Ligand SMILES: C[C@H](N)C(=O)NCc1cccc(N2NC(C(F)(F)F)=C/C2=C2\NN=C(c3cccc4[nH]ccc34)O2)c1
Ligand SMILES: C[C@H](N)C(=O)NCc1cccc(N2NC(C(F)(F)F)=C/C2=C2\NN=C(c3cccc4[nH]ccc34)O2)c1
């Protein structure tokens with residue numbers, strides 16, 4: 001509904017087909033930091049689950065609902081829109097938990113729950129936190145949340161920071177410059193070079209990297225899942241003013257995210273920062289086609305603007321300038337089509 | 343509309359969007375054997391192009407049309423359905439060939455040509471030759487071909503041969519056994535192990551391999567583009583009898599393809615065989631659900647049946663038996679969702 005509204009079928013069909021593969025559920029489950037942190041966040045806040053009713057938004061294999069079960073929940077509604085829902089039902093049976101975990105096929109925007117829930121859990125985070133637009137589904141699900149019900153995760157921080165990394169910049173530039181060739185098999189491609197450069201630099205780069213390449217402390221943008229509304233994520237405007245710690249070419253901004261589970265007994269954090277062990281999300285870098293030259297001490301300022309689209313992703317706009325010189329850089333990146341360098 | 347009749351809308355949007363990326367055109371152009379052989383086939387049969395009218399079905403960057411121009415063609419209509427058509431137009435301008443190459447946006451099934459052509463050129467071949475179902479477009483284009491006009495390529499051969507590769511087979515289970523564990527964070531996953539096995543076996547494997555895994559001489563299935571009709575590719579039945587040159591466990595069938603340009607001056611071949619240098623098509627392997635033991639001398643017989651679907655691909659059905667023992671196997675595979683092992 002709300003879902004069909006914001007989503008083209010050519011997208012929502014391809015999307016849920018992807019999460020119908022066991023191997024893709026496996027990719028997430030295998031991420032030990034992710035899965036192990038969720039289990040610990042849930043088991044260590046057992047009072048948040050003991051005898052409670054819970055909703056698992058996008059249960060996939062069902063793994064998070066089993067954690068809720070382990071922690072004493074009385075009833076768990078496990079909503080899943082892809083065919084994976086059937087495999088989850090199989091696991092519920094084979095694990096003898098039919099009396100507590102109830103699989104409900106369909107989009108959380110479109111199904112009905114027999115009752116309101118004390119707590120919603122989900123693992124909706126995408127690359128750069130926001131990709132896939134599933135955070136909106138998670139927020140949407142709050143229509144089933146009892147007053148003063150809890151959200152696991154409770155908040156999310158996106159971090160961005162300027163980086164230098166010229167091996168990357170040049171590896172992407174060299175790819176583009178195939179289209180600079182004046183005589184490919186006798187044919188001059190060079191008029192497209194600009195188009196080429198644009199296309200390659202529109203791809204955010206997903207992989208990890210040494211923290212040494214960061215040139216200033218990260219700026220933080222926070223979403224409070226207890227408080228935000230779906231619509232807060234349609235247009236995300238992240239202003240930044242970095243205070244440069246090193247001089248050098250700025251080749252772009254790197255992004256990563258943390259979420260926190262604020263339970264009654266303790267807060268637990270899941271981080272995908274480059275200072276932390278690798279997760280299946282790696283990190284994300286948006287390159288500038290034309291890097292900015294900065295001296296330690298300069299401030300680099302501008303805006304990262306994320307505009308949600310109907311492909312369950314975002315068009316990313318990044319404008320940055322070195323205040324001291326007036327050197328500007330503007331970029332547009334298409335989060336739907338990442339470059340997996342790893 | 344012949345095109346839209348046989349194609350799910352979603353599939354076509356994703357399909358043509360893919361070919362709108364310069365980097366994907368580049369993947370084909372960079373394939374030196376592919377591109378180099380096309381140029382040579384065209385330039386060395388220059389009498390087939392000199393002062394002729396040509397149609398380039400799915401011109402992409404336009405590269406093949408420039409080869410027709412280099413060979414003296416008087417007029418070339420370059421048809422292209424993705425947004426790549428715009429970049430091709432830019433190239434035609436920047437190369438000062440607007441008088442000779444005419445880019446026509448749209449599907450070859452849906453556009454109009456001002457005149458009939460002497461020769462159609464195309465590079466429509468997909469994985470396993472037939473993937474993408476673009477050969478039908480190429481055949482469909484013949485409605486513009488003058489009587490006794492030529493097709494470049496003129497014919498295509500698909501080869502299949504039994505292979506033994508014990509590691510590739512067992513790998514399927516090694517992976518699926520991820521699910522065969524009784525307490526994954528406290529959850530017994532084993533009920534899904536079969537599903538995960540079936541999932542991996544439905545994917546054709548794309549990569550190359552050493553020619554020593556092959557256990558018999560290939561069997562050939564030929565399409566004559568001068569003669570075939572679109573409809574001949576809706577249901578492709580390929581019978582096979584292999585005489586086994588080596589004893590061992592057959593784990594599947596390997597596929598590759600060659601096409602021949604039969605020109606007035608000479609016939610030129612493009613081969614993607616494993617005995618030849620690698621191309622961007624690699625080769626394709628379909629595993630048997632369970633291996634079949636054969637002695638050198640025995641015969642392995644059966645049918646590979648390719649059934650086109652509305653996702654611009656095929657459902658692959660393979661049945662095989664060793665005649666001497668009556669041992670038999672079958673597999674069903676989705677050619678639309680290949681596993682890229684390389
Ligand atoms: C929302 C959910 N909580 C979540 O974690 N979202 C992201 C997500 C979901 C499912 C799988 C993965 N992946 N993990 C890995 C591995 F190899 F590193 F293990 C690769 C991978 C791909 N492969 N292909 C993709 C991919 C490509 C393009 C757009 C995409 N949108 C979502 C995944 C994805 O990820 C990532
Ligand atoms: C029709 C045309 N003549 C033709 O050659 N068709 C096949 C084709 C067309 C365009 C690009 C490619 N590719 N080349 C490479 C490289 F890295 F090895 F260079 C990868 C690749 C992918 N990447 N992803 C795919 C892919 C995946 C799943 C379904 C698909 N259907 C078509 C391509 C494709 O190919 C292959």
Ligand SMILES: Nc1ncnc2c1ncn2[C@@H]1O[C@H](CSCC[C@H](N)C(=O)O)[C@@H](O)[C@H]1O
Pocket residue numbers: 003016019020028029057058059060061062063064079080081082084106107108109122123124134137
């Ligand atoms: N609107 C929506 N309704 C229901 N499920 C959705 C949804 N959007 C995404 N999903 C599902 O949510 C899952 C995201 S990945 C998380 C899977 C699992 N909970 C785990 O933590 O391992 C996928 O299974 C996906 O198909």
Ligand SMILES: Nc1ncnc2c1ncn2[C@@H]1O[C@H](CSCC[C@H](N)C(=O)O)[C@@H](O)[C@H]1O
Pocket residue numbers: 345358361370371399400401402403404405406421422423424426448449450451464465466476479
């Ligand atoms: N029905 C159809 N009508 C027109 N173009 C089509 C088509 N089906 C596929 N194509 C186009 O055909 C191309 C196949 S790849 C070949 C591109 C270029 N001729 C080369 O040889 O490098 C793609 O650009 C694709 O979008």
Ligand SMILES: [Cl-]
Pocket residue numbers: 014015018
């Ligand atoms: Cl996807």
Ligand SMILES: [Cl-]
Pocket residue numbers: 356357360
């Ligand atoms: Cl595609």
